[PDB]
Write an enzyme that holds these catalytic residues in place. Structure first.
Site, PDB file in Angstrom:
ATOM      1  N   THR B  37      63.941  32.675  54.581  1.00  0.00           N
ATOM      2  CA  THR B  37      63.751  33.831  53.706  1.00  0.00           C
ATOM      3  C   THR B  37      64.443  33.714  52.356  1.00  0.00           C
ATOM      4  OG1 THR B  37      65.423  34.838  55.142  1.00  0.00           O
ATOM      5  CG2 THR B  37      63.181  35.700  55.280  1.00  0.00           C
ATOM      6  N   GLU B  64      76.684  24.854  58.503  1.00  0.00           N
ATOM      7  CA  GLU B  64      75.663  23.982  59.063  1.00  0.00           C
ATOM      8  C   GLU B  64      75.183  22.914  58.081  1.00  0.00           C
ATOM      9  OE1 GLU B  64      72.193  25.955  61.173  1.00  0.00           O
ATOM     10  OE2 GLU B  64      73.638  25.810  62.814  1.00  0.00           O
ATOM     11  N   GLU B 305      36.883  34.892  38.934  1.00  0.00           N
ATOM     12  CA  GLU B 305      35.565  34.793  39.550  1.00  0.00           C
ATOM     13  C   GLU B 305      34.758  33.578  39.135  1.00  0.00           C
ATOM     14  OE1 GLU B 305      33.896  38.644  38.370  1.00  0.00           O
ATOM     15  OE2 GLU B 305      34.586  39.393  40.315  1.00  0.00           O
ATOM     16  N   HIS B 450      35.423  59.081  20.432  1.00  0.00           N
ATOM     17  CA  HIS B 450      34.362  58.356  21.139  1.00  0.00           C
ATOM     18  C   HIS B 450      33.023  59.093  21.357  1.00  0.00           C
ATOM     19  CE1 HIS B 450      33.823  59.967  25.190  1.00  0.00           C
ATOM     20  NE2 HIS B 450      35.127  60.159  25.286  1.00  0.00           N
TER      21      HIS B 450
HETATM   22  N1  ATP Z   1      61.405  24.882  43.784  1.00  0.00           N
HETATM   23  C1  ATP Z   1      61.011  25.664  44.777  1.00  0.00           C
HETATM   24  N2  ATP Z   1      59.889  26.428  44.466  1.00  0.00           N
HETATM   25  C2  ATP Z   1      59.367  27.337  45.360  1.00  0.00           C
HETATM   26  N3  ATP Z   1      59.957  27.512  46.605  1.00  0.00           N
HETATM   27  C3  ATP Z   1      61.066  26.764  46.937  1.00  0.00           C
HETATM   28  C4  ATP Z   1      61.638  25.814  46.055  1.00  0.00           C
HETATM   29  N4  ATP Z   1      62.708  25.284  46.746  1.00  0.00           N
HETATM   30  C5  ATP Z   1      62.827  25.828  47.953  1.00  0.00           C
HETATM   31  N5  ATP Z   1      61.804  26.762  48.086  1.00  0.00           N
HETATM   32  C6  ATP Z   1      61.546  27.618  49.306  1.00  0.00           C
HETATM   33  O1  ATP Z   1      62.744  28.391  49.493  1.00  0.00           O
HETATM   34  C7  ATP Z   1      63.151  28.368  50.849  1.00  0.00           C
HETATM   35  C8  ATP Z   1      64.590  27.884  50.990  1.00  0.00           C
HETATM   36  O2  ATP Z   1      65.348  28.809  51.789  1.00  0.00           O
HETATM   37  P1  ATP Z   1      66.944  28.653  51.786  1.00  0.00           P
HETATM   38  O3  ATP Z   1      67.345  27.199  52.100  1.00  0.00           O
HETATM   39  O4  ATP Z   1      67.387  29.123  50.446  1.00  0.00           O
HETATM   40  O5  ATP Z   1      67.621  29.679  52.816  1.00  0.00           O
HETATM   41  P2  ATP Z   1      67.085  30.455  54.091  1.00  0.00           P
HETATM   42  O6  ATP Z   1      65.655  30.105  54.367  1.00  0.00           O
HETATM   43  O7  ATP Z   1      67.330  31.865  53.806  1.00  0.00           O
HETATM   44  O8  ATP Z   1      68.056  30.090  55.280  1.00  0.00           O
HETATM   45  P3  ATP Z   1      68.138  28.654  55.993  1.00  0.00           P
HETATM   46  O9  ATP Z   1      69.530  27.993  55.700  1.00  0.00           O
HETATM   47  O10 ATP Z   1      67.849  28.860  57.458  1.00  0.00           O
HETATM   48  O11 ATP Z   1      66.992  27.803  55.411  1.00  0.00           O
HETATM   49  C9  ATP Z   1      62.186  27.483  51.624  1.00  0.00           C
HETATM   50  O12 ATP Z   1      61.550  28.303  52.619  1.00  0.00           O
HETATM   51  C10 ATP Z   1      61.207  26.923  50.595  1.00  0.00           C
HETATM   52  O13 ATP Z   1      59.850  27.049  50.853  1.00  0.00           O
HETATM   53  N1  ATP Z   2      40.930  63.248  18.953  1.00  0.00           N
HETATM   54  C1  ATP Z   2      40.094  63.436  19.953  1.00  0.00           C
HETATM   55  N2  ATP Z   2      38.846  63.937  19.589  1.00  0.00           N
HETATM   56  C2  ATP Z   2      37.854  64.187  20.524  1.00  0.00           C
HETATM   57  N3  ATP Z   2      38.088  63.939  21.859  1.00  0.00           N
HETATM   58  C3  ATP Z   2      39.319  63.462  22.234  1.00  0.00           C
HETATM   59  C4  ATP Z   2      40.356  63.193  21.314  1.00  0.00           C
HETATM   60  N4  ATP Z   2      41.386  62.725  22.059  1.00  0.00           N
HETATM   61  C5  ATP Z   2      41.069  62.680  23.363  1.00  0.00           C
HETATM   62  N5  ATP Z   2      39.767  63.127  23.485  1.00  0.00           N
HETATM   63  C6  ATP Z   2      38.916  63.261  24.758  1.00  0.00           C
HETATM   64  O1  ATP Z   2      39.684  63.829  25.842  1.00  0.00           O
HETATM   65  C7  ATP Z   2      39.614  62.997  27.018  1.00  0.00           C
HETATM   66  C8  ATP Z   2      40.987  62.718  27.689  1.00  0.00           C
HETATM   67  O2  ATP Z   2      41.502  63.972  28.128  1.00  0.00           O
HETATM   68  P1  ATP Z   2      42.987  64.253  28.725  1.00  0.00           P
HETATM   69  O3  ATP Z   2      44.058  63.408  28.029  1.00  0.00           O
HETATM   70  O4  ATP Z   2      43.104  65.689  28.462  1.00  0.00           O
HETATM   71  O5  ATP Z   2      43.188  64.254  30.300  1.00  0.00           O
HETATM   72  P2  ATP Z   2      42.399  64.137  31.639  1.00  0.00           P
HETATM   73  O6  ATP Z   2      40.961  63.860  31.445  1.00  0.00           O
HETATM   74  O7  ATP Z   2      42.679  65.395  32.335  1.00  0.00           O
HETATM   75  O8  ATP Z   2      43.162  63.105  32.463  1.00  0.00           O
HETATM   76  P3  ATP Z   2      43.199  61.560  32.170  1.00  0.00           P
HETATM   77  O9  ATP Z   2      44.653  61.169  31.878  1.00  0.00           O
HETATM   78  O10 ATP Z   2      42.591  60.904  33.384  1.00  0.00           O
HETATM   79  O11 ATP Z   2      42.330  61.262  30.939  1.00  0.00           O
HETATM   80  C9  ATP Z   2      38.847  61.741  26.638  1.00  0.00           C
HETATM   81  O12 ATP Z   2      37.863  61.495  27.651  1.00  0.00           O
HETATM   82  C10 ATP Z   2      38.240  62.025  25.267  1.00  0.00           C
HETATM   83  O13 ATP Z   2      36.879  62.213  25.243  1.00  0.00           O
HETATM   84  N1  ATP Z   3      21.335  33.835  27.942  1.00  0.00           N
HETATM   85  C1  ATP Z   3      21.238  35.037  28.478  1.00  0.00           C
HETATM   86  N2  ATP Z   3      20.200  35.828  27.977  1.00  0.00           N
HETATM   87  C2  ATP Z   3      19.953  37.114  28.450  1.00  0.00           C
HETATM   88  N3  ATP Z   3      20.739  37.631  29.451  1.00  0.00           N
HETATM   89  C3  ATP Z   3      21.772  36.871  29.943  1.00  0.00           C
HETATM   90  C4  ATP Z   3      22.051  35.558  29.494  1.00  0.00           C
HETATM   91  N4  ATP Z   3      23.114  35.144  30.223  1.00  0.00           N
HETATM   92  C5  ATP Z   3      23.503  36.083  31.099  1.00  0.00           C
HETATM   93  N5  ATP Z   3      22.654  37.165  30.941  1.00  0.00           N
HETATM   94  C6  ATP Z   3      22.653  38.497  31.706  1.00  0.00           C
HETATM   95  O1  ATP Z   3      23.995  38.967  31.933  1.00  0.00           O
HETATM   96  C7  ATP Z   3      24.249  39.137  33.341  1.00  0.00           C
HETATM   97  C8  ATP Z   3      25.583  38.520  33.814  1.00  0.00           C
HETATM   98  O2  ATP Z   3      26.592  39.219  33.107  1.00  0.00           O
HETATM   99  P1  ATP Z   3      28.175  38.896  33.093  1.00  0.00           P
HETATM  100  O3  ATP Z   3      28.469  37.398  33.090  1.00  0.00           O
HETATM  101  O4  ATP Z   3      28.531  39.548  31.837  1.00  0.00           O
HETATM  102  O5  ATP Z   3      29.140  39.706  34.088  1.00  0.00           O
HETATM  103  P2  ATP Z   3      29.159  40.907  35.109  1.00  0.00           P
HETATM  104  O6  ATP Z   3      27.837  41.507  35.356  1.00  0.00           O
HETATM  105  O7  ATP Z   3      30.110  41.844  34.502  1.00  0.00           O
HETATM  106  O8  ATP Z   3      29.930  40.422  36.342  1.00  0.00           O
HETATM  107  P3  ATP Z   3      29.405  39.411  37.419  1.00  0.00           P
HETATM  108  O9  ATP Z   3      30.294  38.164  37.401  1.00  0.00           O
HETATM  109  O10 ATP Z   3      29.408  40.177  38.715  1.00  0.00           O
HETATM  110  O11 ATP Z   3      27.967  39.026  37.062  1.00  0.00           O
HETATM  111  C9  ATP Z   3      23.026  38.628  34.086  1.00  0.00           C
HETATM  112  O12 ATP Z   3      22.707  39.554  35.137  1.00  0.00           O
HETATM  113  C10 ATP Z   3      21.938  38.530  33.029  1.00  0.00           C
HETATM  114  O13 ATP Z   3      21.015  39.547  33.033  1.00  0.00           O
END
Ligand code: ATP
Ligand code: ATP
Ligand code: ATP
Ligand code: ATP
Ligand code: ATP
Ligand code: ATP
Lengths: 484, 484, 484
Positions: B37, B64, B305, B450
């Site tokens: 640990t 030890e 991812e 917004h």
């Molecule tokens: N550079 C390092 N980076 C990441 N982990 C490390 C590194 N060096 C050692 N460790 C980890 O730290 C642990 C060393 O434990 P340590 O010798 O400090 O005492 P302990 O486990 O509490 O008691 P015991 O004397 O029974 O081992 C190991 O389990 C090992 O995986």
């Molecule tokens: N200057 C501004 N003008 C217009 N709308 C604003 C402005 N500032 C904040 N807002 C709006 O108010 C909202 C945030 O509200 P708020 O801080 O009251 O708390 P809440 O919604 O109760 O809780 P949370 O902390 O989850 O946002 C945003 O969604 C935004 O649309």
């Molecule tokens: N060259 C391209 N032209 C038109 N559409 C595209 C092109 N490349 C990717 N896309 C579109 O964008 C999508 C993938 O989007 P993205 O990589 O932004 O992430 P995400 O939807 O947020 O997350 P995830 O990893 O789950 O897909 C696809 O479903 C596709 O429709």
């Protein structure tokens, strides 16, 4: 005597409520718990208060810790025992072994200890006595049977002397046997268990009075905190439902709102603002806080989601200057992550903050934030806590709640608190013509009439503007209406 | 000394925050845990830091491990104890037995050693002492009672000597008794427990300060890591809600978006992009990272991812060249499977990477990916960690979340994190005329105004193009509209 | 009575029902439980009732408590044993050890004690005998085998003597072995187990008759309370379904409603008012209470959500003066948080309040509040209790229930109690033209016809005004109807 059994107050905040008066006089009370639970603290706080509040001299027997240490540590609580020792109000009887121990001491010490204890009790006219870790004494090489006699003897003699004693025992399992040998429980007339329950990487301190032969007492566990002022217990189940109620109104910070509420919030009331994130609860809170300073009244804003700086940036952008609020000493912002402590602690910090600042209004931005992780029952207990404290204190309180789902929410609160609150204000998104608009609704108000309309409202630099209802729509509560 | 308890800093990152100063001076602190640990590490790092940070010599008593190994092992953290031994700053008191010997040498050496140690303490003017595995000493043939006396003697003497000690103990159960003989607990003035909890084939180290006689400390467990720089602890519950907030703006990488956010993202803010797979969160990330380079600012992209290569391919197909971004040393891509480590480790790797590259912007592709398997509470704790660090560091942060269900999603985040973020960007599929079109929506912005419109948008080789809302539709949010 | 075994009544409330007549005569009944479960109280009450009700002299053998303490403690329940000892009706046999003692005695004493007890029994012409904590006697140094012989001996001799005995034993686990040496269980003729179960920080005491050689009895655990009157047991499963039923009607306090109920509620009936917060259940309760006083009848309002003050402020705002109601001594308000005690206690408090006030009407505002935390099975058991008591007592009762979700609720009660109630009144919100209107509905009435309309109603200073149904609407129950 010819009556029940008289108790002695411990003046330990909360305990005397739980014990229906305090410890049974002339008897010993067993206080056990695992390491670091607060056994010693309890035993000292029992003596000290005895001295400082009724001038009842006390004898403190120690079997492990040194007298210097005991006095050293007590300083942690602004406790000056060394002074009391001088004044001869407190006598620390050192029973701890010497760095050069010797065998078989399970009889000489028993009668000798009592002789000394008795001697000291008589010498200083002690009224209270507390023995720290009697466990350690026979932790020399004994069995449950041998342990049961020795304890019986010790308790018996102390009884004869008429000393109201506090005995400390150690445990090893938070919910296993009450004490080490599984015998101490039955030998004592009174038993108190201090628990330091883990559960999810957090620690919760509780106190329970298992039994008190001869009288009544509150049953079950009760959370407590160890602070700079020692043990602090909250008998959340002892708070009476006798809160004061009036017809006096107060503004929300929003005039139109006040109208919808039939003339503003009641001074003696708990208001709840629910809605999805972004709906604007945090705004209503600000406008609530400011309205208290505009009428030169003190208000506390316990923020658990936004930083101190952010609250200020967003507040300024809604107009209202929080800066001035603070300088004028009318507004106090706290701020802290719900993960920084357990509910019990938070509850206390809220209370103390209220006492050191005499607030008129209080707002907790997001109870829903404090409900993270914690169990529902622990949470409700917290809510009832801060809620009732506010009610009995004539403090108007506004609480925030962010529903887990925007639009479609079928229940006001996921945690089910709406039943505990007086007035409910609901904020909700309404999809209209490919746009995300807001709506405000006074869901309920216990003493007033309040508007039944679901009014849409915009948010600007000026703040919140409550407009009209969507009279020409259906299924608005759902978030995606049907124009008609 | 008629004052509170005085502590000595360990300089072990995080420990002094949890211990509210460090170990209480002149007292012994018990540090137990199961095999591996990090007990030894703690005790050594305790001495080392003492020598290197305050030039306080130290005595290390081993029962030890061999002194050669203790030095050999320390090299793992770039510790040259051998050097400190020569400089007479550190003295390793070899108390280990030899391949041969005799018996019936109980408290014999327990007394001789209390001298051999007193010797080295005086000889090198030691201030800090650490005894590794005192447990193994009486692991010769003793009972709980015999162990309590020997410990009490040792601690007591070391206390007289005035040395501040750290005592190592072993346990067999992660949540069972604190130490082997369930006696040490009550004998020590301070208790620290190191746990290596399994749970789901993953290991999670946590440290807890059970008690500190006389002072306060943080309660519960705290995650920590063992790296090339030793024990690293994260007091995630100690982080204060005092983050800096400004009105400065920055670009999203998408002009039309910037407009909808009423002028762009705030520098001091955390943005969340939510939507089903395919909606295009990964695109917005790419575009957000490129915009920081276009302004010659450093940005890191933690991808959980997609592979390093794939991110390039897809980024290039959207225009923006990630190749150049890297050469110009303005953009840093990480990439790693959430399964390759626990949240604690990840959180740290994120931090260090930020320190070795001074990012101005940060993007974590899929927080939802890091949520795999892990408990919601362990996750929220990770989010608050990364979220806060970024906030107090003036770093603008964009985090991605894939909702479990495309279309119909009634909640922004399944893990419930929307409450912790400043700006929420929601992407969603919309079935229109037998086709899957997209829509972008600025769900909320705490400081800005917004746009509230739900704007459809397409994706091309040029990137994202935000068009108009579906003014003539109903139940858009649901995913399956109805034209009016 | 068709039972092969002659029993002796304990007169302990509820026990004789559970034991089908009382304790078998001439036999011994083991009564074991953990510390503080009520063993002594049981045995003492057993002798006491024996003396006061049947003039049956009793012998009490104590092995640990002192004769003075046993007398001192009994004063807690207002019993004067000292008086009975003088009159020669009660004899306390001191068998406890002295605070000087030795070692070895648990054997011949078993013969010395036998001869001793036989003396007392003969001298006082005793009929009842209770030995408190026989466990502690061989708690000197014995094994399971030695214990079985000794007990069997004691029991056997007591049987010859013809005495009906109660023997107390201690257990360490609430559900583990029946008694310490896991041998007492089989040696005794009857076994009673007193439990004090924790579970969720609350304590629940239960009593169970595990066995009774020769006769039947109630099986399982039964909740009981210790009060100023001793042990009080509720055989909730012994309550017979033979409640009296009449066609007599009574007003609800609202004339229109009465019409809806086909002429008002039945005197002998239990009514249920369900709806989301704000719907007005609390209002109907008030009006239900007020009406009993307007007819010079006593009624109790048990409130578990609003303070005594608030109930008054709101009541007055709805007209009806609660002040006068109290003075005229026609209305009694209770008020208490459901967390202030377990269901068992609550149930008992409700009962007593009813006896000390002979109510004609009763109203529990929010059963759904008493359902917080508690298990559904424990809750239903509570509902069947209050409900049944009311029924067999010709007391009309109106219970309240708040549904966890406003609008859309598919079930009348989340707790599933509707099946236990006679008349159900449903209140609900109806979204109509951007506004929240209320709807009242008589869902069912067992003996009457009742109106089937879902009338909308408004709340004013005057109170509830029941108007007409929404004939031109579809999906009313849904909460957001469609105008057709
Ligand atoms: N550079 C390092 N980076 C990441 N982990 C490390 C590194 N060096 C050692 N460790 C980890 O730290 C642990 C060393 O434990 P340590 O010798 O400090 O005492 P302990 O486990 O509490 O008691 P015991 O004397 O029974 O081992 C190991 O389990 C090992 O995986
Ligand atoms: N200057 C501004 N003008 C217009 N709308 C604003 C402005 N500032 C904040 N807002 C709006 O108010 C909202 C945030 O509200 P708020 O801080 O009251 O708390 P809440 O919604 O109760 O809780 P949370 O902390 O989850 O946002 C945003 O969604 C935004 O649309
Ligand atoms: N060259 C391209 N032209 C038109 N559409 C595209 C092109 N490349 C990717 N896309 C579109 O964008 C999508 C993938 O989007 P993205 O990589 O932004 O992430 P995400 O939807 O947020 O997350 P995830 O990893 O789950 O897909 C696809 O479903 C596709 O429709
Ligand atoms: N000023 C203080 N504020 C908050 N906590 C404190 C303060 N002083 C001490 N504590 C805490 O109180 C505890 C002290 O426990 P205490 O010495 O009263 O008895 P114990 O733990 O029950 O038994 P033992 O003698 O084995 O320690 C420590 O765990 C410590 O964290
Ligand atoms: N007037 C009273 N009202 C309510 N509870 C009481 C009253 N008097 C005593 N009690 C409770 O009754 C219990 C007394 O238990 P009792 O002395 O009957 O035997 P026991 O707990 O079974 O065994 P032991 O001899 O170990 O204590 C205590 O736990 C106490 O809280
Ligand atoms: N003077 C009044 N005029 C008009 N309406 C009133 C008045 N007083 C209270 N109300 C209304 O009655 C509602 C509160 O109803 P009530 O006290 O009957 O109990 P409930 O809804 O059943 O339960 P609870 O409110 O305790 O959750 C408020 O929402 C409000 O609309």
């Amino acid at each position: 005597e010819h009556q029940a059994i008289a108790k002695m107050r411990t003046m330990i905040e909360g305990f005397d409520d739980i014990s229906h008066g305090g410890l049974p006089i002339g008897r010993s009370t067993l206080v056990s718990g695992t390491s670091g639970t607060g056994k010693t603290l309890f035993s000292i706080q029992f003596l000290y208060n005895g001295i400082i509040e009724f001038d009842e001299p006390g004898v403190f027997v120690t079997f492990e810790e040194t007298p210097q240490d005991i006095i050293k540590n007590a300083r942690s609580f602004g406790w000056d025992l060394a002074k009391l020792v001088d004044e001869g109000k407190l006598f620390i009887l050192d029973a701890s072994p010497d760095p050069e121990g010797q065998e078989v001491v399970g009889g000489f010490d028993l009668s000798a200890l009592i002789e000394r204890i008795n001697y000291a009790i008589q010498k200083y006219r002690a009224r209270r006595v507390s023995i720290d870790s009697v466990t350690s004494v026979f932790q020399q090489y004994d069995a449950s049977s041998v342990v049961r006699r020795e304890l019986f003897r010790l308790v018996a003699r102390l009884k004869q002397i008429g000393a109201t004693t506090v005995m400390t025992t150690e445990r090893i399992e938070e919910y296993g046997p009450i004490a080490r040998y599984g015998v101490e429980e039955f030998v004592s007339d009174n038993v108190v268990i201090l628990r330091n329950v883990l559960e999810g990487e957090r620690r919760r301190r509780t106190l329970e009075i298992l039994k008190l032969r001869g009288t009544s007492h509150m049953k079950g566990e009760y959370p407590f905190t160890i602070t700079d002022h020692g043990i602090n217990i909250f008998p959340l189940g002892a708070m009476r439902l006798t809160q004061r109620s009036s017809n006096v109104r107060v503004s929300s910070g929003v005039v139109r709102l006040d109208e919808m509420c039939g003339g503003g919030f009641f001074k003696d009331s708990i208001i709840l603002a629910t809605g999805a994130t972004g709906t604007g609860k945090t705004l209503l809170v600000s406008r609530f806080v400011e309205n208290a300073c505009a009428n030169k009244e003190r208000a506390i804003l316990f923020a658990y989601e936004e930083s101190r700086a952010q609250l200020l940036r967003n507040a300024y952008s809604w107009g209202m200057d929080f800066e001035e609020m603070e300088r004028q000493n009318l507004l106090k912002i706290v701020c802290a992550y719900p993960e920084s402590a357990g509910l019990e602690d938070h509850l206390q910090i809220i209370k103390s903050e209220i006492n050191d600042f005499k607030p008129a209004r209080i707002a907790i931005d997001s109870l829903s934030a404090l409900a993270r992780g914690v169990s529902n029952n622990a949470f409700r207990q917290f809510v009832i806590g801060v809620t009732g404290y506010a009610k009995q204190e004539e403090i108007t309180g506004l609480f925030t709640n962010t529903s887990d789902q925007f639009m479609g929410a079928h229940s006001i609160t996921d945690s089910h608190i709406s039943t505990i609150t007086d007035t409910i204000i609901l904020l909700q998104y309404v999809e209209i013509r490919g746009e995300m608009s807001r709506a405000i609704n006074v869901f309920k108000m216990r003493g007033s009439w309040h508007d039944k309309a679901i009014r849409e409202f915009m948010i600007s630099d000026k703040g919140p503007d409550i407009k009209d209802s969507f009279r020409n729509f259906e299924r608005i509560i759902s978030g995606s209406p049907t124009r008609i």
